[PDB]
């Protein structure tokens, strides 16, 4: 644990179904992400940090913990995104005569910063007497052996811990789930998914001059306005599909049950009589070349009224 190993996983695809469906783990706790979502997500990198502790210390491998393990051996940051997985390894790390291979730092001069490793074996100075590399009084060897034995209790048996840190940076994603990518469909309202970033909208070819290190652009509201296609490295603009209010133009139900409908601010192609106003698309109203007083206001100088065989007209 004091010299925890870190492997870098990059440029690969992992099916995490085999992971969270495994019964070999006693602890499986994800932070910032769900275990079942990992197959739908892509990450810039993954860091698999592996080590051994004892059972009573597994709780210390978690964001916002304190103790010997957390303070002196392995500290997870508060904004940690990842998954901590621990499983009992009594059959592997316990010897009858005592397994002294595994050590943990028992004293340190301060706390470790997140994802910081200390392998120094300098003799710890517990007081004001310098040790000069020799044990004695107020001088300790900073590392203490676990000495796992098969007869130990559950809280002292050895547990193997792997922490998977999923880096979600702005760089191109290189670790993904086993999700097959469909073809790119443009000019249509679709539900899209780029490197695990999901959304709904219309994708169009863009003239934005992305720099090589940029993978997406954001708007003022912090919404992804453009993306780089991970396979054919082209920039795509993402726009909301089409939306707007729907107004019903009616004479009194005493007068008639016939109504017209205004789709506000929508072209007469996203949606009898269809009339393109500056207020939107008007359906069910007969446009007339005559001009009368405003009866029901539509907007932009356009008003609607029920007139003579009788129908709703716009003018």
């Amino acid at each position: 644990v004091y010299a925890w190993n870190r492997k870098r996983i990059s440029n690969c695809v992992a099916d995490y179904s085999v992971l969270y469906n495994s019964a070999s783990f006693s602890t499986f706790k994800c932070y910032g992400v769900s275990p079942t979502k990992l197959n739908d997500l892509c990450f810039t990198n993954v860091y698999a940090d592996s080590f051994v502790i004892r059972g009573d210390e597994v709780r210390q491998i978690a964001p916002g913990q304190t103790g010997n393990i957390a303070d002196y051996n392995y500290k997870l940051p508060d904004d940690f995104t990842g998954c901590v997985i621990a499983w009992n390894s009594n059959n592997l790390d316990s010897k009858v005569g005592g397994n002294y291979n595994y050590l943990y730092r028992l004293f340190r001069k301060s706390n470790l910063k997140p994802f910081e490793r200390d392998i120094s074996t300098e003799i710890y100075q517990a007081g004001s007497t310098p040790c000069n590399g020799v044990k004695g009084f107020n001088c300790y060897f900073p590392l203490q052996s676990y000495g796992f034995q098969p007869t130990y209790g559950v809280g002292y048996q050895p547990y193997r811990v792997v922490v998977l840190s999923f880096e979600l940076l702005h760089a191109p994603a290189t670790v993904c789930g086993p999700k097959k990518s469909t073809n790119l469909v443009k000019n249509k309202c679709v539900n899209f998914n780029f490197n695990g970033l999901t959304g709904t909208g219309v994708l169009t070819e863009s003239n934005k001059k992305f720099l090589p290190f940029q993978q997406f652009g954001r708007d003022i509201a912090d919404t992804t306005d453009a993306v780089r296609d991970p396979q054919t490295l082209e920039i795509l603009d993402i726009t909301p599909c089409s939306f707007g209010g729907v107004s019903v133009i009616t004479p009194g139900t005493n007068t008639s049950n016939q109504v017209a409908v205004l789709y506000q601010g929508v072209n007469c192609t996203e949606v009898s009589n269809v009339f393109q106003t500056r207020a939107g698309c008007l359906i069910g109203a007969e446009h007339v070349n005559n001009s009368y007083e405003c009866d029901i206001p539509i907007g932009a100088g356009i008003c609607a009224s029920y007139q003579t065989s009788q129908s709703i007209i716009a003018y």
Partner: antibody
Amino acid sequence: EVQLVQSGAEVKKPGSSVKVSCKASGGTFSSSVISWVRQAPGQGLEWMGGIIPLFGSANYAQKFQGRVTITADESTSTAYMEMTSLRSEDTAVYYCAKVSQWALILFWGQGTLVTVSS
Amino acid sequence: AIRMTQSPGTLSLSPGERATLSCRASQSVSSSYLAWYQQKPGQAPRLLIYGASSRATGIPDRFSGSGSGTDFTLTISRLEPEDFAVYYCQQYGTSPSWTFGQGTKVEIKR
């Protein structure tokens, strides 16, 4: 957990083609490397080729580069090894080994004895 | 392609002695993907070691693998009548490119 079962032993006349199957269980098939290993009688094990079912791009040993074709089917979790233009030297036991990406251990089938006799 | 060559070609010893088989890789082979198989005549290969140091299920503790780089060694501490068979070293990985050693046979010294 994981278990591989191969097709039955085959007796094929020279000049024909055989297609040995390997059905896998345990739900680790897609994210695995599944390879075919051939053992001629009285000779050491020999690796023919392999494939990752997720990708579907099979790789073969230079000796078996052209004569063999290895395919994988995720929808049924089955690997197939097809050898065409069988010869007398092809009489051998064909095993299908499997390595998960989450384990370093290898999972083997029971073997498929193929006899190329006229 | 990486070539795995075993040594010695044939090992002759007596029960209770120490058997040491070696496996040479033409290139630097990761120790995580080295396996040792035991095959008695008339039987399918039986995996003994994986990861170059991990015993499989039911493998007696006298079997023990080790090594790294281009040298990988299997060390049977105490031969028994059951420990006389052909031993192969397999270099594998998470890519479809594996190889086997030519095979080392351990026989009774008489």
